[PDB]
């Protein structure tokens, strides 16, 4: 079973999108 990206793959967004709020600032 080699399928984890399916997770961290969707998390990367939840992370970036999180740093998009006021992260840049």
> How many alpha or pi helices?
1
- The span between the termini is 40 Å
Helix content: 55-70%
Structural class: mainly alpha
Output the radius of gyration: 12 Å
Q: Strand content of the residues, in percent?
A: under 5%
What about the largest sheet?
none
Overall spatial form = rod-shaped
The total count of strands amounts to 0
| Quaternary organisation of the protein chains | monomer
Output the helix-strand order: H
PDB class: metal transport
Keywords: hCtr1 TMDs, oligomerization, metal transport
Assembly: monomeric
Entry title: 1H Chemical Shift Assignments for the first transmembrane domain from human copper transport 1
Map the helices and strands.
Blueprint lengths: L4 H17 L4
Quick summary of this structure?
By secondary structure, the protein is mainly alpha-helical.
Describe this structure in words.
The structure is a monomer. With 25 residues, the chain is mainly alpha-helical. Helix content is 68%, strand content 0%. The longest helix has 17 residues. It comes from Homo sapiens (Human). Mobilizes copper(1+) out of the endosomal compartment, making copper(1+) available for export out of the cells.
């Amino acid at each position: 079973k080699n399928t984890a990206g399916e997770m961290a793959g969707a998390f990367v967004a939840v992370f970036l999108l999180a740093m998009f709020y006021e992260g840049l600032k």
